[PDB]
Amino acid sequence: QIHYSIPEEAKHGTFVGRIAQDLGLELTELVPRLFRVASKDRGDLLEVNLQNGILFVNSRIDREELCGRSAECSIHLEVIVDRPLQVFHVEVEVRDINDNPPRFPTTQKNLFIAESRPLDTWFPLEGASDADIGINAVLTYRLSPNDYFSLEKPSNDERVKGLGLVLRKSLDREETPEIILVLTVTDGGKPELTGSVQLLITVLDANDNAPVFDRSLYTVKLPENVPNGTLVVKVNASDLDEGVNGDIMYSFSTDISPNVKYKFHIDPVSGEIIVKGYIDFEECKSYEILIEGIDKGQLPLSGHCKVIVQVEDINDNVPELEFKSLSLPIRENSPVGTVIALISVSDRDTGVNGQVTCSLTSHVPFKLVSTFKNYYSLVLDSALDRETTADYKVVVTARDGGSPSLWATASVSVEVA
Amino acid sequence: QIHYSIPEEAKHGTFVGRIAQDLGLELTELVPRLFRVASKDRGDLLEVNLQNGILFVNSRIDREELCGRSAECSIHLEVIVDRPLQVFHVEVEVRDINDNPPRFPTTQKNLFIAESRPLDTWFPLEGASDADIGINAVLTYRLSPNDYFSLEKPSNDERVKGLGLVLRKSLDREETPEIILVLTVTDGGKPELTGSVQLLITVLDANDNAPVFDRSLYTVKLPENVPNGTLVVKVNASDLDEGVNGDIMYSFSTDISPNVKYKFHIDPVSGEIIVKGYIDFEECKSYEILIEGIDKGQLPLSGHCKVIVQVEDINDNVPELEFKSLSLPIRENSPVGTVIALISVSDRDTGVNGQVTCSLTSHVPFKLVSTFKNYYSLVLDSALDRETTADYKVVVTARDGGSPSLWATASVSVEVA
Ligand SMILES: *[C@@H]1O[C@H](CO)[C@@H](O)[C@H](O)[C@H]1NC(C)=O
Ligand SMILES: *[C@@H]1O[C@H](CO)[C@@H](O)[C@H](O)[C@H]1NC(C)=O
Ligand SMILES: *[C@H]1O[C@H](CO)[C@@H](O)[C@H](O)[C@@H]1O
Ligand SMILES: *[C@H]1O[C@H](CO)[C@@H](O)[C@H](O)[C@@H]1O
Ligand SMILES: *[C@H]1O[C@H](CO)[C@@H](O)[C@H](O)[C@@H]1O
Ligand SMILES: *[C@H]1O[C@H](CO)[C@@H](O)[C@H](O)[C@@H]1O
Ligand SMILES: *[C@H]1O[C@H](CO)[C@@H](O)[C@H](O)[C@@H]1O
Ligand SMILES: *[C@H]1O[C@H](CO)[C@@H](O)[C@H](O)[C@@H]1O
Ligand SMILES: [Ca+2]
Ligand SMILES: [Ca+2]
Ligand SMILES: [Ca+2]
Ligand SMILES: [Ca+2]
Ligand SMILES: [Ca+2]
Ligand SMILES: [Ca+2]
Ligand SMILES: [Ca+2]
Ligand SMILES: [Ca+2]
Ligand SMILES: [Ca+2]
Ligand SMILES: [Ca+2]
Ligand SMILES: [Ca+2]
Ligand SMILES: [Ca+2]
Ligand SMILES: [Ca+2]
Ligand SMILES: [Ca+2]
Ligand SMILES: [Ca+2]
Ligand SMILES: [Ca+2]
Ligand SMILES: [Ca+2]
Ligand SMILES: [Ca+2]
């Protein structure tokens, strides 16, 4: 056993060692004895010049093609001489040379990371492989200086495995749709060789945003007895998420009043609220409708808006007349100033639509006077004469100030005693 | 017009006012003239005693049953006397009394709020209604002193509407499944009346938790050529979410080596990895398998574990013999120590499974000697005699140290010159 040592990938004709002398042989002895050198399994990697007895590198010695991922590598040369036939053994180690760079399976990698992913959670990032063995194979990793993600180098200790790509900062798809990272790797053996990777990460859309109405409060005015289907309002809502997490369906809140839910209808898609049932100002002066906009995600989110509608009074109620008192038949002796009947007037409407004025036929001695708001007394004006006219027919007309106006009458047969 | 003023719900016989004197009438004048008092639309709410000329409360005067939600309330009494017939008008206002408490539509309310709901977002909380009007109707709200939610009282200003139930602290379904709030409301008018509500809020399950393996690293040892289907490992993963967000499907990572993906199979449900293809120690010493556990939510989350398996070498390779040199035919003159053939031995296995010893038939003059590791030279021992035996048959047996062991032979016909 005689041991030599050379680095791989050596230049053609590299001095391995004077094999003749080291085997105790002499120069004039080499040629006649047919000094031969053979390899075990490889081939013509090493050759011997007989004139100087020098063992040298014959062909390209690629270490990784021989031992591969093995730590120890050595070419075994058997040496044969004849007359007499002697056999010697020389083993020459092949030291590793850092002539291969750290390579990744993919130069660019599309990663898909969810927006809902918790912090302090790492994603399996592929590591680079190296053909070399030893310090030349010791890999050092480096992440691009970005704020969203951090890197954690693997350790030898058990219960901890995998190249670390750790979350420490929150992520939002709407703010930044894609993040581009760069992973650089350098071996430990000099000269240094590098490897780069362009990680293209597209953050997935999570349903973490609720729909939002342009106006948080809508105020519309609606007349009375407007036909069903009349466009009350048109609402618009928006949502930052995409897909079914972005599409919005409209509805009335579950806390809505039954009468309100029966008086109005809302298009789930259009968001336009229209009149459904009869609307009376004298029944309800206004309505306060809560509107819910809800997306179509797995876990639905809801936004809300308040739509208050003030009903507007129209003159649609005919005035009411009522004789509350009577003093009939009236004596002929009755002086000027006596009261015959007390009149009461009402109007269900409001404002000028409910402001009623009263009049009467002028062919009657009696007079009409306002004693109080919406109250009249039919007072005898001028004198009478029983035999001339023993009877009268007092028609009283009540008329509101609406535009247009409604009117009602009330007659009374006034007999004279 | 003569005006009086009384609080509602007055005791029977409550002094409203001396109506006779205030109308300028006299006591002895009331009875003969049939002093009468009537209401406009209500009825026998007020009555007059003629002996003292006193107007008083006759029956129960419930304000809210009269004017309702109206601000102004007043009973209109028309007064009639006869001989001569005169008509007077007295209006008596009915002031509001805080005799009705703030009432909610529901004493207890099941609210359903998502775990994914953003902060600073309020949920529509129903308000209480009150029959009274004025300061007695001014409502003050109060939320139970809880940490998760806060309350925001409604304002008169537009663009701001709805009873505020504001999120300011994060919410987690797994930590606290339900939160119970208490809403208390007090009117502004004295005496104070209250209203309580038990809000039962059940936070909905969001898919915000990734599955987690009990062990982040599994290390198993597997022999060689073990039949396909052999249980390599059994992995367990857990997840805090419920439903389809909790169920976990197992698989091999997308970055797995093709050979590894073809050599092993993993049950998506059971999580048990078994042998699929042939496994050779001489081809691959070990495997590093990344295992992904992914839930079945709308936005899937994935946990990962590393399962490394070290293959164990078995003695399944028969030793190799090789005659690398020959000096036949051997001269009879050849002395003791001459070399006939050089022998080389190999074994693809490792350890004692690859430790080969050599022997030979003892009925042969020649000798076997170790020159180097796995190398033998067939050296002539003792002397010869051409005419006696002109030929030989040297059988050499190589045998590894495995348990059990494998062996191979190599014979050579040694002719003597
Ligand atoms: C609603 O969405 C946005 C406003 O947020 C606007 O661009 C769009 O035109 C609106 N659609 C309608 C129908 O008004
Ligand atoms: C896996 O889930 C838990 C451990 O996290 C355990 O209670 C359960 O029994 C395990 N199941 C199996 C089949 O090992
Ligand atoms: C009021 O008076 C008119 C005329 O007399 C009637 O036609 C009407 O029906 C109401 O009685
Ligand atoms: C008004 O109408 C009534 C009938 O409703 C008559 O009786 C009265 O004389 C006046 O014409
Ligand atoms: C008023 O009207 C009535 C209607 O019949 C008469 O009967 C009465 O005499 C007076 O003319
Ligand atoms: C080694 O030698 C044995 C005995 O001669 C043979 O049977 C075998 O095939 C191998 O050649
Ligand atoms: C071993 O076997 C060979 C044939 O393979 C013979 O030629 C030899 O003589 C020895 O018997
Ligand atoms: C070794 O074996 C061979 C087998 O044929 C013979 O031919 C030779 O003479 C010697 O005996
Ligand atoms: Ca190389
Ligand atoms: Ca190398
Ligand atoms: Ca290298
Ligand atoms: Ca989103
Ligand atoms: Ca978002
Ligand atoms: Ca959404
Ligand atoms: Ca009306
Ligand atoms: Ca009217
Ligand atoms: Ca009206
Ligand atoms: Ca009351
Ligand atoms: Ca009251
Ligand atoms: Ca009250
Ligand atoms: Ca959850
Ligand atoms: Ca959770
Ligand atoms: Ca989950
Ligand atoms: Ca094997
Ligand atoms: Ca073996
Ligand atoms: Ca083996």
mmCIF file of C-alpha atoms in Angstrom, chain B residues 9-126:
data_model
loop_
_atom_site.group_PDB
_atom_site.id
_atom_site.type_symbol
_atom_site.label_atom_id
_atom_site.label_comp_id
_atom_site.label_asym_id
_atom_site.label_seq_id
_atom_site.Cartn_x
_atom_site.Cartn_y
_atom_site.Cartn_z
ATOM 1 C CA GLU B 9 -103.819 59.525 34.840
ATOM 2 C CA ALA B 10 -105.259 61.771 37.548
ATOM 3 C CA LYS B 11 -107.180 60.479 40.560
ATOM 4 C CA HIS B 12 -110.975 60.317 40.246
ATOM 5 C CA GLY B 13 -112.439 63.668 41.266
ATOM 6 C CA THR B 14 -109.330 65.731 40.597
ATOM 7 C CA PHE B 15 -109.995 69.473 40.693
ATOM 8 C CA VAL B 16 -109.614 70.751 37.132
ATOM 9 C CA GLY B 17 -111.043 74.198 37.819
ATOM 10 C CA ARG B 18 -114.095 76.201 38.859
ATOM 11 C CA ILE B 19 -115.617 76.329 35.381
ATOM 12 C CA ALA B 20 -118.821 78.132 36.410
ATOM 13 C CA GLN B 21 -117.202 81.238 37.899
ATOM 14 C CA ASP B 22 -114.532 81.395 35.189
ATOM 15 C CA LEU B 23 -117.304 81.427 32.580
ATOM 16 C CA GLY B 24 -118.803 84.373 34.449
ATOM 17 C CA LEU B 25 -121.827 82.302 35.436
ATOM 18 C CA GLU B 26 -123.417 82.162 38.895
ATOM 19 C CA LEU B 27 -124.362 79.202 41.102
ATOM 20 C CA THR B 28 -128.138 79.732 41.113
ATOM 21 C CA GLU B 29 -127.927 80.074 37.339
ATOM 22 C CA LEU B 30 -126.351 76.669 36.628
ATOM 23 C CA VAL B 31 -129.185 74.320 37.603
ATOM 24 C CA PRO B 32 -132.157 76.045 35.934
ATOM 25 C CA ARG B 33 -130.276 76.576 32.664
ATOM 26 C CA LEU B 34 -129.269 72.900 32.550
ATOM 27 C CA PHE B 35 -125.538 73.604 32.743
ATOM 28 C CA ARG B 36 -124.025 70.932 30.506
ATOM 29 C CA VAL B 37 -120.482 69.940 29.561
ATOM 30 C CA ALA B 38 -119.559 67.686 26.643
ATOM 31 C CA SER B 39 -116.315 66.478 25.070
ATOM 32 C CA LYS B 40 -115.499 66.703 21.365
ATOM 33 C CA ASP B 41 -114.682 63.073 20.520
ATOM 34 C CA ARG B 42 -113.544 61.442 23.760
ATOM 35 C CA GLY B 43 -116.439 61.044 26.189
ATOM 36 C CA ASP B 44 -117.075 61.192 29.932
ATOM 37 C CA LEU B 45 -113.511 62.149 30.851
ATOM 38 C CA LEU B 46 -114.507 65.311 32.719
ATOM 39 C CA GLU B 47 -117.630 66.130 34.737
ATOM 40 C CA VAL B 48 -119.101 69.208 36.436
ATOM 41 C CA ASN B 49 -120.694 69.462 39.864
ATOM 42 C CA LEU B 50 -123.394 72.127 39.719
ATOM 43 C CA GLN B 51 -123.636 72.928 43.436
ATOM 44 C CA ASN B 52 -120.079 74.301 43.469
ATOM 45 C CA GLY B 53 -119.634 74.757 39.725
ATOM 46 C CA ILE B 54 -116.537 72.563 39.710
ATOM 47 C CA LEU B 55 -115.046 70.864 36.661
ATOM 48 C CA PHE B 56 -113.212 67.687 37.652
ATOM 49 C CA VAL B 57 -111.712 64.449 36.331
ATOM 50 C CA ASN B 58 -114.483 61.887 35.898
ATOM 51 C CA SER B 59 -112.843 58.807 34.371
ATOM 52 C CA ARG B 60 -109.270 57.653 33.731
ATOM 53 C CA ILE B 61 -107.506 60.017 31.338
ATOM 54 C CA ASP B 62 -104.801 58.033 29.531
ATOM 55 C CA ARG B 63 -102.858 60.535 27.425
ATOM 56 C CA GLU B 64 -101.190 58.036 25.081
ATOM 57 C CA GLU B 65 -104.604 56.579 24.237
ATOM 58 C CA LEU B 66 -105.783 60.029 23.150
ATOM 59 C CA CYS B 67 -103.071 62.050 21.415
ATOM 60 C CA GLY B 68 -100.745 59.058 21.154
ATOM 61 C CA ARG B 69 -97.328 60.050 19.843
ATOM 62 C CA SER B 70 -98.529 63.640 19.425
ATOM 63 C CA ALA B 71 -96.689 66.395 21.299
ATOM 64 C CA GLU B 72 -99.710 68.527 22.168
ATOM 65 C CA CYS B 73 -102.689 67.008 23.960
ATOM 66 C CA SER B 74 -105.841 68.730 25.192
ATOM 67 C CA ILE B 75 -109.440 67.775 25.896
ATOM 68 C CA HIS B 76 -111.896 70.157 24.260
ATOM 69 C CA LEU B 77 -115.024 70.740 26.329
ATOM 70 C CA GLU B 78 -118.015 72.532 24.871
ATOM 71 C CA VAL B 79 -120.317 74.039 27.482
ATOM 72 C CA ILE B 80 -124.039 74.545 26.938
ATOM 73 C CA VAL B 81 -126.509 76.581 28.958
ATOM 74 C CA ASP B 82 -130.133 77.368 28.129
ATOM 75 C CA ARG B 83 -132.595 80.241 28.584
ATOM 76 C CA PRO B 84 -131.097 81.887 26.660
ATOM 77 C CA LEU B 85 -129.007 79.226 24.907
ATOM 78 C CA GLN B 86 -125.319 80.086 25.238
ATOM 79 C CA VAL B 87 -122.277 78.055 24.184
ATOM 80 C CA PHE B 88 -118.801 78.369 25.707
ATOM 81 C CA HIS B 89 -115.434 76.741 24.963
ATOM 82 C CA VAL B 90 -112.947 75.384 27.496
ATOM 83 C CA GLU B 91 -109.764 73.604 26.443
ATOM 84 C CA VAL B 92 -107.836 71.675 29.081
ATOM 85 C CA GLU B 93 -104.338 70.459 28.221
ATOM 86 C CA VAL B 94 -103.218 66.979 29.244
ATOM 87 C CA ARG B 95 -99.579 67.026 30.332
ATOM 88 C CA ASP B 96 -97.476 63.888 29.922
ATOM 89 C CA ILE B 97 -96.612 61.647 32.868
ATOM 90 C CA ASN B 98 -93.663 59.241 32.712
ATOM 91 C CA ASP B 99 -95.776 56.180 33.527
ATOM 92 C CA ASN B 100 -94.451 53.947 30.738
ATOM 93 C CA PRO B 101 -90.999 52.275 30.688
ATOM 94 C CA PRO B 102 -88.699 51.912 27.650
ATOM 95 C CA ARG B 103 -89.542 48.538 26.098
ATOM 96 C CA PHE B 104 -87.549 46.389 23.674
ATOM 97 C CA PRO B 105 -89.220 44.195 21.023
ATOM 98 C CA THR B 106 -87.260 41.244 22.426
ATOM 99 C CA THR B 107 -86.067 40.747 26.010
ATOM 100 C CA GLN B 108 -83.373 38.408 24.690
ATOM 101 C CA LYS B 109 -81.708 38.508 21.290
ATOM 102 C CA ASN B 110 -79.565 35.876 19.574
ATOM 103 C CA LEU B 111 -76.889 37.697 17.579
ATOM 104 C CA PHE B 112 -74.645 35.940 15.062
ATOM 105 C CA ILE B 113 -71.350 37.734 14.456
ATOM 106 C CA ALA B 114 -68.529 36.370 12.287
ATOM 107 C CA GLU B 115 -65.020 35.776 13.636
ATOM 108 C CA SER B 116 -63.610 37.328 10.466
ATOM 109 C CA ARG B 117 -65.390 40.666 10.971
ATOM 110 C CA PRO B 118 -63.014 43.678 10.751
ATOM 111 C CA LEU B 119 -62.400 46.038 13.672
ATOM 112 C CA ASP B 120 -64.182 49.398 13.978
ATOM 113 C CA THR B 121 -67.327 47.918 12.420
ATOM 114 C CA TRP B 122 -70.711 48.164 14.146
ATOM 115 C CA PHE B 123 -73.650 45.745 14.106
ATOM 116 C CA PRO B 124 -77.268 46.981 13.871
ATOM 117 C CA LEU B 125 -78.605 46.704 17.413
ATOM 118 C CA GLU B 126 -82.353 47.232 17.849
#
